Structure formats: structure tokens, C-alpha cells
Amino acid sequence: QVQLQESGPGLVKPSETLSLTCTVSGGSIDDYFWNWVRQPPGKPLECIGYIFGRGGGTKYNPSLDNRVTISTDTPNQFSLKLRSVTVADTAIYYCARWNLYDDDFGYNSFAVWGRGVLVTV
Amino acid sequence: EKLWVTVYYGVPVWKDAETTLFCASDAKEKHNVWATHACVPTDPNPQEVVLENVTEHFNMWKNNMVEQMQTDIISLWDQSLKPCVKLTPLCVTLNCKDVNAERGEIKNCSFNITTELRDKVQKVYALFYKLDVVPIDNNNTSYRLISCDTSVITQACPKISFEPIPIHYCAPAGFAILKCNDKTFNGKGPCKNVSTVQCTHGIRPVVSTQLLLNGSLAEEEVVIRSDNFTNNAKTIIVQLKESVEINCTRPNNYTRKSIRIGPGRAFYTMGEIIGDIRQAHCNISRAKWNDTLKQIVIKLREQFENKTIVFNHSSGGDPEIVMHSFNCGGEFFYCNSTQLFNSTWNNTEGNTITLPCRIKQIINMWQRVGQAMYAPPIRGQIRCSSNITGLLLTRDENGTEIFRPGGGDMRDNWRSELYKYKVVKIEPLGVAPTRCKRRGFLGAAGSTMGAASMTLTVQARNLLSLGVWGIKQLQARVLAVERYLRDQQLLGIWGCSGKLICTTAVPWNASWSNKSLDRIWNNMTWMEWEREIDNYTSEIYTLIEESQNQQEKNEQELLCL
Amino acid sequence: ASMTLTVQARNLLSLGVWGIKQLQARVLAVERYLRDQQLLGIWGCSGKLICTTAVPWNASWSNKSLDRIWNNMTWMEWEREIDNYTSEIYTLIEESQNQQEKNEQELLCL
Amino acid sequence: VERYLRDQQLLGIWGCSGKLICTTAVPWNASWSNKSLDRIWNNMTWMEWEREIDNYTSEIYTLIEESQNQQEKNEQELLCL
Amino acid sequence: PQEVVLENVTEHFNMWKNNMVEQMQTDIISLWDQSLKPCVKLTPLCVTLN
Amino acid sequence: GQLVQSGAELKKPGASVKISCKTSGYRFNFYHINWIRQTAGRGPEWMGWISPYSGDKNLAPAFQDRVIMTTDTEVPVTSFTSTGAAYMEIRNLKFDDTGTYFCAKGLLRDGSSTWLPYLWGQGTLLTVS
Amino acid sequence: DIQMTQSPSSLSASVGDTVTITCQARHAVGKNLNWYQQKPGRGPQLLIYMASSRHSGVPSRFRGSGSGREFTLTINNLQPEDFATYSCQQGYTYPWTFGQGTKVEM
Ligand SMILES: *[C@@H]1O[C@H](CO)[C@@H](O[C@@H]2O[C@H](CO)[C@@H](O[C@@H]3O[C@H](CO[C@H]4O[C@H](CO)[C@@H](O)[C@H](O)[C@@H]4O)[C@@H](O)[C@H](O[C@H]4O[C@H](CO)[C@@H](O)[C@H](O)[C@@H]4O)[C@@H]3O)[C@H](O)[C@H]2NC(C)=O)[C@H](O)[C@H]1NC(C)=O
Ligand SMILES: *[C@@H]1O[C@H](CO)[C@@H](O[C@@H]2O[C@H](CO)[C@@H](O)[C@H](O)[C@H]2NC(C)=O)[C@H](O)[C@H]1NC(C)=O
Ligand SMILES: *[C@@H]1O[C@H](CO)[C@@H](O[C@@H]2O[C@H](CO)[C@@H](O)[C@H](O)[C@H]2NC(C)=O)[C@H](O)[C@H]1NC(C)=O
Ligand SMILES: *[C@@H]1O[C@H](CO)[C@@H](O)[C@H](O)[C@H]1NC(C)=O
Ligand SMILES: *[C@@H]1O[C@H](CO)[C@@H](O)[C@H](O)[C@H]1NC(C)=O
Ligand SMILES: *[C@@H]1O[C@H](CO)[C@@H](O)[C@H](O)[C@H]1NC(C)=O
Ligand SMILES: *[C@@H]1O[C@H](CO)[C@@H](O)[C@H](O)[C@H]1NC(C)=O
Ligand SMILES: *[C@@H]1O[C@H](CO)[C@@H](O)[C@H](O)[C@H]1NC(C)=O
Ligand SMILES: *[C@@H]1O[C@H](CO)[C@@H](O)[C@H](O)[C@H]1NC(C)=O
Ligand SMILES: *[C@@H]1O[C@H](CO)[C@@H](O)[C@H](O)[C@H]1NC(C)=O
Ligand SMILES: *[C@@H]1O[C@H](CO)[C@@H](O)[C@H](O)[C@H]1NC(C)=O
Ligand SMILES: *[C@@H]1O[C@H](CO)[C@@H](O)[C@H](O)[C@H]1NC(C)=O
Ligand SMILES: *[C@@H]1O[C@H](CO)[C@@H](O)[C@H](O)[C@H]1NC(C)=O
Ligand SMILES: *[C@@H]1O[C@H](CO)[C@@H](O)[C@H](O)[C@H]1NC(C)=O
Ligand SMILES: *[C@@H]1O[C@H](CO)[C@@H](O)[C@H](O)[C@H]1NC(C)=O
Ligand SMILES: *[C@@H]1O[C@H](CO)[C@@H](O)[C@H](O)[C@H]1NC(C)=O
Ligand SMILES: *[C@@H]1O[C@H](CO)[C@@H](O)[C@H](O)[C@H]1NC(C)=O
Ligand SMILES: *[C@@H]1O[C@H](CO)[C@@H](O)[C@H](O)[C@H]1NC(C)=O
């Protein structure tokens, strides 16, 4: 019954920093990769990045020229910061939970998805 | 006119089936990763009866032998690495600095090892390749091993050799291997020259991607094989007539230091640089590759019509996927195979192509995740001498076809070789009408009904009769004995205690086959007949059992009084 | 001895280190007995403890009279004496059976 | 498989491999059971009969196998000349 | 036991070459290793002792 | 099974001709293929049979030095059918050779009646004038 | 990155029919494939993980299988609640690329 809710502005102009916050309801943050992904209109879903646990190792989609920073703010909230946003970055942004362990359902898959927030430019 | 059912045991008939085959190794120990002990010694001389008049349909792309080889090689790889040291206490934060010379490819990494003595913390220095080392912070000096956080890293024992050895697969009792002896065979289709073999030719399980190294060559011309040829994203296996040669060298000389992990376990790592820091420059003769590309694009124009054909490099991305990957010398190479596919053909510098290559020690094999292998470094130069034997091409729009070096999982590295062989289950029992009442194996399979009914003896004689490989073999042998007892009980309940040919005296109905004996015992193979009476097999069998034995048994029970 | 050869026939069929081993032993025994039954079968001697085959004793194997082969010699001595030629005997029996069967009725009664 | 092979082998040595009911040359020894055919075939179940003559049954088995089949099977080979 | 004495037999018995012996050797080693395997290893006690 | 032959042809005396037979829907290798000619003034007669399996030939005694027979190699199209071809060439035409030449597929692979023609084509009209 | 494609880009189907969707990887991914379901107004739902294992609570009707670069999702006995956009994702290399998506229409 873990649920994820995205929040943030629905309109950001070009070249400032886009800030989103995913809040985890039901349960506290645990040792699963927490991932930001997006779906632009007419495009497949594109992974943006992920952070492990409550502060820890991160990784980011190499084909973004380091414009993305992800960090944990609260034991049940983490956040996405995407710099130098352009018009190509309009998309529905989702936060998702990626499992690391093969003893549970959804091994190596986004088992838990949030509703998703539409951000335009 | 007065025709009766007669049961024939030992018929040369077969149907497509999937089973587990026995691995056999050349007679010719080294602890080679694919264990010799698991596989039985090969027969000194194989037998290849040249089945005549048999035109079987082969299909490389639906062949259970390839998947069985994938499973078997994965199992042998895992079992060979089972008793080796597991690098659990080496995920420690590594303080790494660039080696003072390639540039940045080798990193001088310091780390604190806490051995099982548990009263010391030893600071140790070791060299790691850049590919196996990833940052963990905004500090430019702090790193960790690339895949040790989501996997258990098993160190390969240095005593295990990775040299290819030819491995045969031999049929178990009850099955047969049919080999296609054609010379221009296109993988999927009928084969006009078929033989039966107990074991396949020597197969080197060479592991590589984008390109097949060592193995057999085509006899007539370069052969291009694909399942559909138009869906795209289906490996276009290319087998060549003449072999180009991949001479490859790693110039750098290294020394292997050992670091204790526990009582009797050691982590083997890279000590220091001896000599200058050079690069691994694989050399391919440009002229020969020219000729090969010509002899391939001609065939591709023949198959895809006269379109412009462009050989592009693979799409960009991580080195493991994009770049070719040898298994030479016990060191895993990854070579930037871009200069080989950089040509537009349609319808001058240098004479040798130098491919740069990077060495990687931490690897994820068989496209698995959560498991990883560490290959310890080798002291001294490594000098390969391989042979170009095949290519794997994949397709991607102005009338130009874009071919790229692609491939797939290692199954496609063996469809290029096991394309002339099929596994078939033999069902020796059959029925035929007669007038009475109560060569080598399958050599007469293509012969008519008459003169194939005289050779059931050899088919009947030769058809029937530890660890993970052990349990699979036990299940196989028990299943074979089951099949044999199925046949023997069917013969017993039909009153054929021990008679390859046993007449029944059951009447031959005319709703099964209306053909006369001359047109049933000639003009047809056993295959066509078995197919013909397929639907009625159950009914006929019932009649052979119910209508007679019971009544004959009751009669004999009533004869002694 | 040739009268007591049916008591030596009802005793050919009786994880962990006592896991695979026992099952292997049972499958071994079964495989041997099935192979021997198959051997007797292909030769056409099914159901017979001793069977008589057309093959003529070439006499090169053992130029000894039946009074000395069947008396003065136990079966062990006979096996040692004729061990080398056994392959030839089996081959003769096989081919002879084959001829004795295909040419007998398999063609006349076809 | 082992049990079926055991039963078929036992039928084989007795010369009854292909018969559900097979008649042997052993005369019935009265010490095993001195009862008439009406006292056996219409009085007892197979369970009761089998329990009655167990050790005697082993004796019957060794007699059918040891002498009857072998004596009838060796004589034939010496009486075909 | 069902021992049966053999009459008129003379066989050449030779210990020091009996497969029985090395078979039981392999077996004792296998059982001992399998039995010990699940038990606790004593790597921690290698630390120096006063 | 179908046997298809080329069309009619007209030639002068002393010429030479080759006629081709194409086979579909049956295994060309298994059965013997033989040539029968319908004369205008005498009626039909037997030319000869060829066995592609060994390439063996047998001809009627009047035409040893007149006709030579050859055959193509079958190309499988499925497991139990194949397409193929045969050719018979006649040298030195006379007026008497005007007539209809037929192919025929043999009845049986083995037995007493393997030689006989069973399945026939449309016939090729050879005119010598 | 590893490019993923799927076929057909869209198909129509009624209630009770069987639907087959093929996902093709540009490079081999072993068995590390996941199948996701997307509906308007709702986040994506996981249907299959590791290319043949159904996620907990997924209806039995959904069947998915494959290996190497080739995988197929078969939906038997199409229900009115199963009309949604289906997509395939890899799991071997990061970023785990998704796919164009197939929309199932009435
Ligand atoms: C692949 O399939 C082809 C087609 O079926 C087989 O070739 C045929 O083989 C048969 C069997 O050999 C040939 O049979 C012909 O039989 C005649 C005599 O045999 C019959 O009569 C005797 C009684 O005398 C019976 O015992 C016997 O069962 C038969 O009923 C001969 O007249 C034929 O001989 C011809 O060829 C020889 C070749 O040296 C010449 O010397 C003769 O003059 C004559 O021309 C012949 O043997 C049959 O003709 C073959 N047909 C073809 C098209 O080749 C292949 O054998 C089969 N492959 C395999 C491995 O079985
Ligand atoms: C059909 O295949 C068989 C088996 O491969 C071929 O027979 C071989 O022919 C070569 C020719 O050099 C011989 O050296 C081998 O000894 C033969 N092998 C056997 C097992 O007999 C045969 O030539 C092929 N026939 C064709 C293509 O018509
Ligand atoms: C890896 O780094 C270590 C320490 O940074 C180097 O070890 C030193 O090597 C120098 C070479 O002149 C010696 O004088 C020092 O005594 C060594 N120090 C220690 C603490 O052992 C090592 O040489 C480096 N290796 C490479 C290949 O650059
Ligand atoms: C348990 O907690 C969950 C949190 O979402 C909530 O939905 C549910 O109603 C809770 N249980 C009860 C009995 O209220
Ligand atoms: C452990 O490694 C750190 C790395 O900063 C180093 O400072 C420290 O001296 C090491 N400790 C020991 C006991 O070797
Ligand atoms: C090849 O793929 C195409 C894709 O449209 C398909 O239509 C065709 O049937 C396939 N052919 C074969 C022989 O599988
Ligand atoms: C490695 O040592 C050999 C010794 O013969 C030498 O030829 C070679 O150049 C050395 N490698 C390098 C990179 O210097
Ligand atoms: C490869 O070619 C380069 C070209 O400079 C040469 O230096 C090197 O020795 C060659 N290596 C081999 C193994 O032939
Ligand atoms: C590869 O090495 C072999 C070793 O015998 C040598 O003969 C050959 O010339 C080398 N090839 C190239 C292209 O340098
Ligand atoms: C394919 O090759 C052409 C030149 O033939 C080149 O322009 C293009 O970038 C290549 N495409 C790739 C690498 O995707
Ligand atoms: C291979 O070398 C070429 C040289 O231009 C370079 O562009 C390319 O990125 C290299 N490929 C890889 C996979 O590193
Ligand atoms: C491909 O060929 C073109 C034209 O010769 C050349 O400019 C380019 O550098 C080549 N690519 C590589 C990777 O060398
Ligand atoms: C063959 O290689 C030469 C250099 O050795 C090069 O100039 C030429 O373009 C190549 N051939 C073709 C057909 O491209
Ligand atoms: C490689 O090719 C050469 C060409 O002469 C040949 O002699 C050699 O046997 C080949 N090696 C293998 C392993 O096939
Ligand atoms: C022999 O079989 C072929 C293949 O079906 C058939 O055309 C032919 O008529 C058969 N012969 C007879 C005599 O029926
Ligand atoms: C036998 O069953 C098959 C099943 O595909 C069918 O096609 C065929 O017509 C049946 N033949 C009979 C009843 O003769
Ligand atoms: C009797 O047996 C002995 C020992 O086997 C042998 O040496 C001797 O020659 C035999 N005598 C005859 C007459 O066969
Ligand atoms: C019938 O069976 C019973 C039960 O054992 C026995 O006591 C009785 O004597 C039997 N009768 C006859 C006539 O055999």
C-alpha cells in the first residue's frame, strides 16, 4: 500500500531550475532506488535519474549533460532539480520505486508508480 | 484381398522432439571452465550413414539444441566458479588517483582491508581499470567497484583456463541426430543430402559478440542466413569462405600481487606497471577485410535486391554492449569495432586497421544481473592469434539499407555452427497389412516399404539401451528405460513376446487405407505410411489388443480341460 | 553346472552420498539386465535359458571333444579358454539369426 | 520399473512369460495342502490361500524354477537330433 | 546373511588392491565433510591470544 | 503430379532437336521417367526409360544411335515433393519421325511394374517436312 | 543506450479475443524485461517483471514470455478493464529504456 505523490509548479519558463517533490505515503523511505522518469508527449518514457535510500549513491541518465540533481529532503519526501530546462523538456514527470531484491515481487522493475504531474514550458 | 494387420518393431520412422543430449569431449586435465570430467570421452571413429532418398526439413531458428547448449554452458560456468574465492570484503571505499603515464584508464587505488585476523587494518595499494571503478561522491578521489553494491563478485580461480576445447553433443538412446550435408544450405528449409550421426562435429564454445571467432567455414560461397530477412531485428548470421585473422596484443607487462582475504583465500590484483603504458591495438589486414566485405555485400545485394548497402558502426552507448568482446588469454578485451564497418558500397590511407581495445576485469556474463565475475590479471604480454570465422549483422530510408554489427545472446553464436543438425525422436512401432495370420541405422529410412522391412534388426538393436549433470543423466536414462518398457509392454499385450515382426490376424478394414498390398508395400516410405494411418493408430492398436489377446487367452485357458 | 543356471538368474535384480549412489546402483542393475535381454532378443533366443543357433562350431576356437569340453572343464576354464573369440561368436550368432529370419518367412510370408 | 521387471523375470524363468494362467509339471505335494479342489476354489479367497502356504510357496517357486522348467528345457535340446 | 559355500573353487584374493577399501575411504571422507559443512567456522578465533 | 512440356516445333530433315520435360508435385528422383512417341502412320511405340537416382538408361533396340537421354537434378520444395526436369535429344530427323512425343512418370518405385508409364503430359508435336 | 521497439504500434480488439504484442530489443537483455500498463488519469502499473513472472495481484489471464532481444506479451480472454497502453522496458543497462507503446482499442 505504498503510494507516491508528485508536487511542484505546472509551468516553468526556459533556463531556470525545475523543482519537483515526490512524497511517499503509507510507508517511510527504504533501501530501494527512488527514480524520476518522464514521458514527453509522443515519446517513450525516459529515465531521468535515481537516488538510493535516505541520502546515498545516485545515478543520472548520461544523455542529459548533467542538468539534473536529485536529493532527499525529508524521511518521506525526495526531490528532483533539473537545471537549464528548455521547451523540449515538457513532459509528465513520475516518481517511482525500483526494487533491488529478487525475493519480492517486481524485481528490477518500477513496482510502485505515482500519479504523475504534467510540467510544460 | 485377405489382408491382416502385422506389427513391425524397429521401423525407421521419426518425429521432431526435444531432449537433453550427452556432452562428449575429445579424448586427447586443466580444470577448463567447461569441465572435462562432466563430459564422456568421444568415440574414436564416428559413424555417418548417408541417408539416401530422405529430404528432411531443417530450421536453425527453432532448434532446442541451441537453448540446451546455452543452459549447459551457463550451468558449467557457474559450477566452475562455485568453489572459487568470493570477493565480499572488497567493496571498501577506494581512494584512487590517476596513474602517471592511454590516460586515466588505470587507477592507483588505496584501500583498507580488514582481514580475518581482526587485530589489524592493512592499507594496501592496487591498480584497477577505469571500467571497473565508479565514483561515490563529489570528491574526485573516492570510488568503488562498479557492480559490487548490487551483486556478489566471484573471483575466477587463476588455475581455470578459458581456452576453447571442441565439445560434441551425442544423442541418448532412443533419439537420433540428423545432419544436413548440403553445401549452400540456407538454415531454414528442406535438405537434399541428409546423414545420421551419433555425435556432432567439434564445436568450440567461443564467447564473443558482434563477431564469431574460430569455427567452421562455408564450402561453396559466403552464406547469409536469416529467419525472415525482412522483419528487421533478426540476426543475419554471416558465414565466410576465407578467414581473416585478428592478431591482438596487450603490450603492457604487469605484476600480480596477492592480498589475503581469509585462511587460504586471496584477492589477486595488479601490482605496478612494468614498462611504458601503451594501448591494445588489434591489427586486421585491410585488404583481406576489403575482400570479405565485398563477398558479403554482393550476397546482401542478391538477397535484398540492388540497393545501396552501408555498413555503419553500432549505436553509441556503454562499452560492453557496443564494442566487440574477445575471450583470449584469460583477459577480457573490449575492442572498438568502428573502423571495420565504415563503408558505403553502392554500385586511401594505410593497409592495416588498428582497433583500440580496453581490458575489463569485472564482468556480467550471459546478460545476467545480480551476479558478477572478476578475472584476475595475467603476468606478461598476451598475444592472440584468432581467425575471423563469422559476422553477426543487424538492420536499422532513401533506398539505402543500413547494416550494423549487432548480434544477440550467445545462442546466436551457435546457430552459426549447429545449422546442419536436428534432433529427432524415433518411434519404432508400426503396423502394415500382410497376407499371413498367426545398411546402417535408418539407412533404409528413405527406401520403400519393401527392403526397409528387412533391416529392422539394426534399428531395434541400436535405438534403445554425480552432481547436476548426473541428475539430468539419471532422469534421461530412466526416461529411456521407461520408453523401452512402453514398447515392450505394448508388444507383450499384442502377443509379440519376442518378434520384431509379429502377425496379428486382425482383419484389415478398408476404411483405414484402401490401397492394395502392391501400392502399400511399394511406392511409399515408412514416413508416408505412418503419417497416412496416423488418425487410426489408436483404433488399430485397440483392435490388436482387445479383439485377440483376451479371446486367445480365454481360448488357451479353455484348452487344457 | 548346466542344470544350476536358473538359480543364478533370479538374483540379477536383488540427496546425499547414499542418495545418487543407491539409485545409480539400481539403474545400473536394471540397465545390465535389460541389455542382456535385448541381446538374447535380437539373437531370437528370447525366453530361453540356453538356445541352439545355426552357426557351425569352426573348431579353430577349441579342437576339443564334447567329452572333454563338457566334462573335465568347469565353466571358468571354458570362459578363459574362449574369451578371445567371444566377439566372433556373437557376430556369427547375430548374422546367422538375421539370415535365419529374413530369408525364412519375412519374404515368403510378406 | 524394478517391480515389473521382477515379476516378468520370475515368469520368464518359469517358462510362462506370455501367459496370465500357465500350467506347470510340478505334482502337488499333499504336505503343502491336502485339500480337494472344491475345498480350495469355492472356500478360500486368494488372500487366505496365499497366507496359508507362504513358506510352502517359496518351496513351490524353487521347484518350478529349479527342476521342471530346466529338466523339460534341457531334455528338448538333447531330443531334437 | 544367506552365505552359500562354494565347492571346488580356488580364487586368488589380494588385499592392498581392493576397490572396497578405497570406496569406503571416499565414503568416510564424503560423510565427514557433509556432516561438518553446516557447522560454524572458527575464522574469528585466529586473532592473537595472550 | 504434373508434367509440362514445351510447345510444338517444325524442322527440316537432317536437323536435330532436344525436347524438355518439367515435373512438379511429385518426387522426380524416385520414379523412372520414360518417353513414348505417337507415330502418325504406325501408332505408338516405346522409346526408353531413365532412372535419375543412378542416371541409368534403357532404350529400345531401334534407337541406340538416334536418341540420347539426360536429366536434371531435383530441387526440393517440401519434404515429399520436388520439381525437376528431363531432356531427350534426337539427331538426324526424317519424315517418319513426325509425331507426338509424350513423357510419362512410372507407376511404382519397386515391385514388378516399376518400368511402366503411368502419368502423362500433354504431348509435344514434332513436325519434319 | 539500447533502443527498444515494439509491434504493432496499435491494434483493435473486442472482449474475449487474444492479443499478442511483440517487444524487440536492439541488444540482448537476457530475461530482464518488464511489462507495464498505462491508463489515462492513473500512473503506470506493473504487469510482468523479469519477462515471465507476473506481479502480485495481476490477473492470471496476462501471459508474457521470451528471452534474448525477443519477447511477447499475450493477453488471453480480453476484458473491458484491460484496454490500456502496454509498454515494455529493459533492465540490464541504465537508463532502462522504455518503448513506443501499443494502445489497445475497442
Ligand atoms: C531411392 O529410391 C529409388 C527409387 O525407388 C531406389 O532405386 C530403386 O531401387 C530398386 C531396388 O534395387 C530398383 O529395383 C529394380 O529391380 C529389378 C529386380 O528387382 C525386382 O525383382 C526381384 C526379382 O528378380 C525382386 O527380388 C526385387 O524385390 C524386385 O521386385 C531390376 O530389374 C532393376 O535393375 C535395374 O537396374 C540395374 C542397375 O545395375 C540394372 O543392372 C538392371 O538391368 C536394371 O536396369 C532394379 O534393381 C529400382 O529400379 C530403383 N529405381 C531407381 C529409380 O533407381 C533407391 O534404391 C532408393 N534408395 C535406397 C537407399 O534404397
Ligand atoms: C552427402 O553427404 C555425404 C556425407 O557428408 C557425402 O559423403 C562424403 O563425401 C566425401 C567427398 O569427399 C567423402 O570424403 C566422405 O567420406 C563422404 N562421407 C561419407 C560418410 O560417406 C556425400 O558426398 C554428399 N553427397 C552429395 C552432396 O551429393
Ligand atoms: C601506486 O601508488 C602507491 C602509493 O601511492 C605507489 O607506491 C609507492 O611507490 C613509490 C615508487 O617510487 C615508492 O617509492 C613508495 O615507497 C611506494 N609507497 C608505498 C606506500 O608503498 C605505487 O608505486 C603506485 N603505483 C603506480 C604503478 O603508480
Ligand atoms: C491502514 O493504513 C492505511 C494507510 O493508507 C489506510 O488506508 C487504512 O485505512 C488503515 N487501516 C484502517 C483500519 O483504517
Ligand atoms: C583507512 O583509510 C583511510 C582513508 O582516508 C586512511 O586515512 C586511514 O589511515 C586508513 N586506516 C588504516 C588503519 O589503515
Ligand atoms: C516477415 O515479417 C513480416 C513483417 O511484416 C511479416 O508480414 C511476414 O509474414 C514475415 N514472414 C515470414 C516468412 O515469417
Ligand atoms: C614486456 O617484456 C618483454 C620482454 O621481452 C618486452 O619485449 C616487452 O617490450 C615488454 N613490454 C613493454 C610494454 O615494454
Ligand atoms: C600492429 O600494428 C602496429 C602499427 O604500428 C605495429 O606497431 C604493431 O607491432 C602491430 N602488432 C602486431 C601484433 O602485429
Ligand atoms: C599475424 O600473426 C601471424 C603469426 O604467424 C603472422 O604470420 C601474420 O603476418 C600476422 N598478421 C598480420 C596482419 O600482421
Ligand atoms: C550511418 O552512416 C552514415 C554515413 O554512411 C553517417 O552519416 C551516420 O551518422 C551513421 N549513423 C549512425 C552511426 O547512427
Ligand atoms: C570508437 O572510436 C571512434 C573514433 O572516432 C569514436 O568516435 C567512438 O566513440 C569509439 N567508440 C566507442 C564505443 O568508444
Ligand atoms: C569513416 O570514413 C570516413 C571517410 O573516409 C572518414 O573520414 C572517417 O574518419 C571514418 N571513420 C573512422 C571512425 O575512422
Ligand atoms: C580497399 O582498401 C583500400 C586501401 O587498401 C581502400 O582504398 C579501398 O577503398 C578499399 N576498397 C573498397 C572497395 O572500398
Ligand atoms: C586460422 O587460419 C589459418 C590460415 O592459414 C589456419 O592455418 C589455421 O588452422 C586457422 N586456425 C584455426 C583455429 O582454425
Ligand atoms: C505412388 O505415390 C505417388 C505419391 O503420392 C502417387 O502419385 C502415385 O499415384 C502412387 N502410385 C500408385 C500406383 O497409386
Ligand atoms: C487426421 O487428423 C488431422 C489433424 O490435423 C486432420 O487434418 C486429418 O484430416 C485427419 N485425417 C483423417 C481422419 O483421415
Ligand atoms: C583335465 O583337466 C586338466 C586340468 O584342467 C587338464 O590339464 C587335462 O588336460 C584335462 N584332461 C583332458 C583329457 O581333457
Ligand atoms: C470353508 O472355509 C472355512 C473357513 O476357513 C473352513 O473352516 C471350512 O472347513 C471350509 N470348508 C470346506 C468344505 O473346505
Concatenated DSSP letters for C17-77?
Answer: TTTHHHHHHHHHHHHHHHHHHHHHHHTT-TT-SS---S----SSS----HHHHSSS--HHH
Please state at what angle helix B467-493 crosses helix B64-80, rounded to 10 degrees: 140
Please indicate whether residue D74, judged by its CB atom, sits closer than 6 Å to ligand 18: no
Contact residues on chain B for C27, CB-CB shorter than 8 A: 474, 477-478, 481
**Positive or negative CA dihedral for F48, F51, F55, F58?**
negative
Q: How far apart are the first and last CA of chain A?
A: 33
CB B16 within 8 A of CB B425: yes
Q: What distance in Å separates the CA atoms of residue G48 and residue G73, rounded to the nearest whole number?
A: 9
Helix ranges (H only) for G7-61 are none
Burial G4-15 (b: 16+ CB within 10 A, else e): bbbbeeeeeeee
Kindly give the distance from the C-alpha atom of residue F111 to the centroid of ligand 1, in angstroms, as a whole number. 9
The conformation of residue C81, written as its DSSP 8-state character, comes to H
CB B336 within 8 A of CB B211: no
User: Ligand 13 atom 8: the closest Cα is on which residue?
Assistant: B348
- Header resolution in angstroms: 3.4
Secondary structure element (H or E) that encloses residue F45, with its range: strand F44-51
**A103 touches B at CB < 8 Å:** no
**A108 touches B at CB < 8 Å:** yes
Kindly give the distance from the C-alpha atom of residue F53 to the centroid of ligand 9, in angstroms, as a whole number. 48
Please indicate whether residue B275, judged by its CB atom, sits closer than 6 Å to ligand 3: no
Q: How far is C106 from chain D (nearest CA, A)?
A: 23
Q: How many CB atoms lie within 10 A of CB B150?
A: 14
Probe site for chain G from B134, B409, B410, B414 (most G CB atoms < 10 A): B409
- Residue type at D61? Y
Q: How far is C12 from chain E (nearest CA, A)?
A: 16
User: What's the residue count for chain G?
Assistant: 106
Q: What distance in Å separates the CA atoms of residue C70 and residue C64, rounded to the nearest whole number?
A: 10
- Per-residue 3-state assignment (H helix, E strand, C coil) for B314-354: CCCCCHHHHCECCCECCEEEEECCCCCCCEECCCCCCCEEE
Contact residues on chain B for A102, CB-CB shorter than 8 A: 370
Q: Coil, strand, or helix at residue F57? A: strand
Size of interface B-E (CB pairs under 8 A): 14
- Residue type at A68? V
Report phi then psi at B509, rounded to 5: -55, 160
Kindly give the distance from the C-alpha atom of residue B435 to the centroid of ligand 15, in angstroms, as a whole number. 22
Q: What distance in Å separates the CA atoms of residue B190 and residue B194, rounded to the nearest whole number?
A: 10
Q: Is the peptide bond before B172 cis (omega within 30 degrees of 0)?
A: no
Q: Which residues contact B200 (CB under 8 A, 6 or more apart)?
A: B168, B169, B170, B177, B179, B418, B421
Q: What distance in Å separates the CA atoms of residue F118 and residue F103, rounded to the nearest whole number?
A: 10
- List the G33-38 sheet strands across, edge first: G10-12, G102-105, G85-90, G33-38, G45-49, G53-54
CB B333 within 8 A of CB B377: no
Q: What distance in Å separates the CA atoms of residue A64 and residue A49, rounded to the nearest whole number?
A: 10
Q: Which of residues 15-74 of G touch B (CB under 8 A)?
A: 24, 26-32, 67-69
Mutate to test the pocket of ligand 5, among B115, B118, B119, B123 (most ligand atoms within 8 A of CB): B123
* Cell numbers found for residue B281: 591495438
Q: Given the DSSP bridges, would you call strands B94-98 and B106-113 parallel, antiparallel or unpaired?
A: antiparallel
Q: Choose among C35, C44, C46: nearest Cβ to B465.
A: C35
Instruction: Find the residue in D nearest to B497 (Cα).
Output: D18
Residue for cell digits 505515482?
A114
Kindly give the distance from the C-alpha atom of residue D39 to the centroid of ligand 18, in angstroms, as a whole number. 7
User: Ligand 13 atom 1: the closest Cα is on which residue?
Assistant: B290
Q: Choose among B485, B553, B560: nearest Cβ to D20.
A: B553
Experiment type: cryo-EM
Taking Cα atoms as reference points, which of B153, B355, B360, B358 lies closest to residue B270?
B360
* Cell numbers found for residue B97: 588517483
Residue for cell digits 545449422?
B419
CB A118 within 8 A of CB A9: no
- Ligand closest in space to the Cα of A25: 4
- Ligand 6 first shell, C-beta below 6 A: B 228, 230-231
CB B324 within 8 A of CB B212: no
Q: How far is E43 from chain B (nearest CA, A)?
A: 6
CA distances from C40 to B463, B488, C51, F42 (A): 16, 14, 9, 65
* Cell numbers found for residue B36: 572435462
Q: What distance in Å separates the CA atoms of residue B100 and residue B111, rounded to the nearest whole number?
A: 19
If phi over 0 gives left and psi between -120 and 50 gives alpha, with beta otherwise, what is residue G77?
left
Q: What distance in Å separates the CA atoms of residue C20 and residue C63, rounded to the nearest whole number?
A: 48
Distance from CA of residue B448 to its chain's centroid?
35
The conformation of residue B414, written as its DSSP 8-state character, comes to H
Taking Cα atoms as reference points, which of B388, B393, B389 lies closest to residue B404?
B393
Probe site for chain C from E30, E32, E33, E37 (most C CB atoms < 10 A): E30
Q: Coil, strand, or helix at residue F22? A: strand
Shortest-distance atom of ligand 13 to CA B343: 14
Size of interface B-F (CB pairs under 8 A): 41
* Cell numbers found for residue C90: 556373437
Q: Coil, strand, or helix at residue D13? A: helix
Report phi then psi at D61, rounded to 5: -60, -50
* Cell numbers found for residue E12: 586368488
Distance from CA of residue B531 to its chain's centroid?
31
Distance from CA of residue B143 to its chain's centroid?
39
Q: Which residues contact B35 (CB under 8 A, 6 or more apart)?
A: B76, B79, B80
User: Furthest-apart CA pair in chain D: how many Å?
Assistant: 48
CB B33 within 8 A of CB B162: yes
* Cell numbers found for residue B521: 508395400
Contact residues on chain B for G32, CB-CB shorter than 8 A: 367, 369
* Cell numbers found for residue B552: 486367445
Distance from CA of residue B551 to its chain's centroid?
53
Where does residue E21 rank: exposed (0-12), middle (13-18), buried (19+ CB within 10 A)?
A: exposed
